[PDB]
Amino acid sequence: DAVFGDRVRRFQEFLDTFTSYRDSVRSIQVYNSNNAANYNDDNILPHRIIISLDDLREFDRSFWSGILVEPAYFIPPAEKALTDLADSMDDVPHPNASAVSSRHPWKLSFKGSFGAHALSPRTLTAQHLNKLVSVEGIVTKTSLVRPKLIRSVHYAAKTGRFHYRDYTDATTTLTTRIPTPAIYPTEDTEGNKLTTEYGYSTFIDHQRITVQEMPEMAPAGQLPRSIDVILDDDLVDKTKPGDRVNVVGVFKSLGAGGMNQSNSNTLIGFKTLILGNTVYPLRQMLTDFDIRNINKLSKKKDIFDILSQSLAPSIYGHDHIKKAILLMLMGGVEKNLENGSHLRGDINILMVGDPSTAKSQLLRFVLNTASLAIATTGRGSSGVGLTAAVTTDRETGERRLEAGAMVLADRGVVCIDEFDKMTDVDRVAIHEVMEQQTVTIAKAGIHTTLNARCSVIAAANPVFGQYDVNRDPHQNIALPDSLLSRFDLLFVVTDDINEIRDRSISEHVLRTHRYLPPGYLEGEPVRERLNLSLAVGEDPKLVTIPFLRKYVQYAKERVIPQLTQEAINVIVKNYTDLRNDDNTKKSPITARTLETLIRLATAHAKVRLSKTVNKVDAKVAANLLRFALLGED
Amino acid sequence: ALPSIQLPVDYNNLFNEITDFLVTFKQDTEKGPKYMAMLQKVANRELNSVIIDLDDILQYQNEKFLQGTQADDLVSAIQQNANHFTELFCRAIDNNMPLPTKEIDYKDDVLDVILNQRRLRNERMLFPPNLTRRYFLYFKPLSQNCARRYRKKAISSKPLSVRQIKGDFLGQLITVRGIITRVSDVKPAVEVIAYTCDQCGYEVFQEVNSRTFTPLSECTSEECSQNQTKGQLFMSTRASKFSAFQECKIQELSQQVPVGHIPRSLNIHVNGTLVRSLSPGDIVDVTGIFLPAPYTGFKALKAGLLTETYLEAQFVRQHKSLTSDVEERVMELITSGDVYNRLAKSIAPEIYGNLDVKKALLLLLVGGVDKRVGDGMKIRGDINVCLMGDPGVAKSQLLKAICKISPRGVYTTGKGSSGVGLTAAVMKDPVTDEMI
DNA sequence: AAAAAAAAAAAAAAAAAAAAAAAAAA
DNA sequence: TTTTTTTTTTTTTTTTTTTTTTTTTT
Ligand SMILES: Nc1ncnc2c1ncn2[C@@H]1O[C@H](COP(=O)(O)OP(=O)(O)OP(=O)(O)O)[C@@H](O)[C@H]1O
Ligand SMILES: Nc1ncnc2c1ncn2[C@@H]1O[C@H](COP(=O)(O)OP(=O)(O)OP(=O)(O)O)[C@@H](O)[C@H]1O
Ligand SMILES: [Mg+2]
Ligand SMILES: [Mg+2]
Ligand SMILES: [Zn+2]
């Protein structure tokens, strides 16, 4: 009534006080308008802006406090004012055939500092209901996208006029209203037959996601907790399972909560939900300074050595394995070939070695430094847990598929630990993914082929406790030959007792164990708790890790080198020399070694930020594979 | 009650323009109207389907623009809403149906006998028109070539995917590209139901416009108005009109799925002569109307305002013998010479070597004599070829390649799936839960 | 003619964990 | 010979929700 109009006036004043929002409205409007005029087209921007809570805090403390504390009485007044401003801006007429019926009202999004309203799915209780909150977590489950009716239009014969009926739901609006039965009117007020006219009605896409707490922040002895978020309109399909997200929305109650005709019970409570306003991913955009630095650092001669050594500075030695990991990070170029085939561009590495040889501390580093990485353990995994699982969608009722570890890491890496301890029934599935890079599901009436293009790095142990040099290589490794053929580089690492090596490595380890984080006193235990302050503002030389991430991203997305003849000449001579020799290698040499040389050469070419494969790339690939197969170093 | 809104579209002028377009339209390139020719063809019990082209409608609009008189952009009205224009066009066809010009040929048509028997008793001593109809009306999507010829852009024929189908496209005419995975059998769906009434008046007709209905079972004729309890209605199948119905599922192609996601699926309903146009395993481009399903019955309450959806199909565009031509192809290949070596060599030209293996695969491709000896003896002509050898010798390209040559072939692999010996007699098919 | 009460409508099923047998070998 | 290995075999439904549509009952 009066309060609604007063708040509309307040927000209207706020809008012309700061001119940025008015300019963004015009930019979106002109973009959408002149896009439709391009008949010879080469797509549509949604009606949603992001305002900062901070600026509103200086403008009007009362309105900011109302939005943060009582959103359900201050957001709808703001949306009407934004719609009015947007309607005022659009001077050009749009006599469209059916856009007159559906207005697509403008909505709002928020950013800035939330103070005490930044929480997690665990610290969210009944004290935060009907409040604007932001929750950080990991997406686990998503529902199928369905259309929902918002307004129905009917045509009346013998009169020629139209009649519309509006529908509302608890999840649709922020205010509780009288419910609607969602049944189309059939009789006019005068009794004339009504015909439903699809194409003038309004439907909106609806989705439900589940956000779980980060498992690293959970208390001792407790399992992580999860919450449900509802997305609508233009927020649909902006998240996938496994993603790390931050969702800003209104925490809301729903239902009757067992205080009704049903029997009295202590086990019945209310249901809680979040109507998300905004979603933020917790792709690093690069400026011209960063790109210029990358191009300047590319021209240095010893760039490969620096890049490889920058990996895991807390590991002493293992230079060649660290080079192989870097070559994994910058994968090869995939070739699509006739007969529906593709040559894989991924590099797969296996490490077999003695106990306590820093095999498992490199997989953990790859988990952190890479863009996408999935961790797996041999004994705690199953075949149905790696490829896909048949489940049900509670909200709609169909039967669907849920992704597994391999398919969730498409265009990523999978790090498997204790690979030899995996059961045989489990080990067949990974075989297929390593060969075809596709999963075939033919269960419960769901016949589908799923794409899985991932790089595999694995660590295992020999049959006995330690590697034996007096026995043949195949006796030491329990893995079958078919599985072993699918790895590009097999590294056998051994711990040998030598006084100088021990003196150096012990010094390095003792130096590492004496590190104090800044801002901590001696003897002060590390407080890895953050004190519930999740965030302050809601949205020889070595190189730093973020710079390496930028370098890897830029190389993967900007250069695609092509093979040359003079590199092929080196590759063929290396292959012919390696094949025809009496040296006893730890792995047999076959016709698939040539493809490994080609892939390593392509990766080294990408490292140099060049569009051609040179002779030096072939030499580096040859040296790496000679070290891997022979140990001639 | 129900508020009222003003919309630009008026159906009276649209109906006038449809009537004008049916009569006036001529193919500019038989002479005369294009569609009154095929209507006369229909009237002779020969054509079972009527297909309208929106390119032709644009041609009529362009003719009117040449005259300069205003039009109602019928092509845009069809695209924005198409469930009502089907009935409008059906009425327009019914109004201007030509007379049977030749070969009336009434032989044993049960509906014809019923209708003819009605005339004598009705005249000596108003039914739903759809009962007398036989033709089926389908629309044809726009063409980019004609569009680019007259600009105006195009939306109905753009090859969208299952995933790009949002809720804003409901009630429009669109096209979807995908692969057909499942197709069901053809079953009859009722359109007009006729009830016979204990020699009370005569049979009554009701139309059905949903997937679910209720029987009448009460005779309301003037002679049946007498008060005595007399009995309910019984359905008569012969005087009722049925239709062929089929449902299929289309799935998104692997190329169009983004990384980390699972492909979606869409449902297609086809009625009429268009039935059986799609088979499993075909990559097609299907045009139709995208409509909301009612989702009623059980589990409707939990959804509340959530609906299913489906596509009423109207057009199909599949992307991809003894004759003198093949009689001459074999002669040409004979004159080519070196048939043995060339046939063996061209098999998988990527792989270099193993030429004797390629000779043997040719002999496996052809089959030996299968002679049925008397007294029960039989001799096999099929070929059993096993290829052993060390790993990494091109073992498993050679095989796959041979599968391409012969259409009747299956590539079966290890214990990942059980298909070699899966001659099972139990099949828990979800559709009906009976063994196959 | 207008109230209060009472049912239908389920459907579904793979994926994992524990325990006892009936065949393999240092 | 006593050890390891191996298939494999039931394990499943007891519950749900508010409309929507039917029969009784003042
Ligand atoms: N070269 C090294 N530099 C630094 N620390 C090392 C090195 N080698 C081993 N370590 C230390 O040894 C410990 C165990 O290493 P890690 O867990 O990586 O071994 P592993 O190869 O996975 O062993 P396992 O065979 O028992 O699974 C860690 O504390 C690690 O820091
Ligand atoms: N004669 C040949 N000509 C061309 N390529 C060959 C030849 N022999 C082997 N190859 C190579 O071998 C590969 C094809 O066989 P591949 O090693 O993939 O499978 P396979 O022989 O069935 O072995 P596995 O036991 O590893 O499955 C390709 O890399 C191909 O280039
Ligand atoms: Mg380990
Ligand atoms: Mg093979
Ligand atoms: Zn009667």
The global form of chain A is elongated
The largest chain-to-chain contact, stated as pair and per-chain residue counts, equals: A-B, 74 and 61 residues
| Strand order in the largest sheet of chain A | 4-8-9-11-10
Task: Quickly give the structural class of chain B.
Answer: alpha/beta
Query: How large is the count of helical segments of chain A?
Result: 19
Number of strands of chain A: 22
Strand order of the largest sheet of chain B: 5-8-9-11-10
- N-to-C span of chain B: 55 Å
Major β-sheet annotation of chain A:
5 strands, mixed, barrel
User: Ends of chain A: how far apart?
Assistant: 83 Å
Number of helices of chain B: 12
Query: Which molecules are bound besides the chains?
Result: adenosine-5'-triphosphate, magnesium ion, zinc ion
Order of helices and strands of chain B: EHHEHHHHEHEEEEEEEHEHHHH
Structural class of chain A: alpha/beta
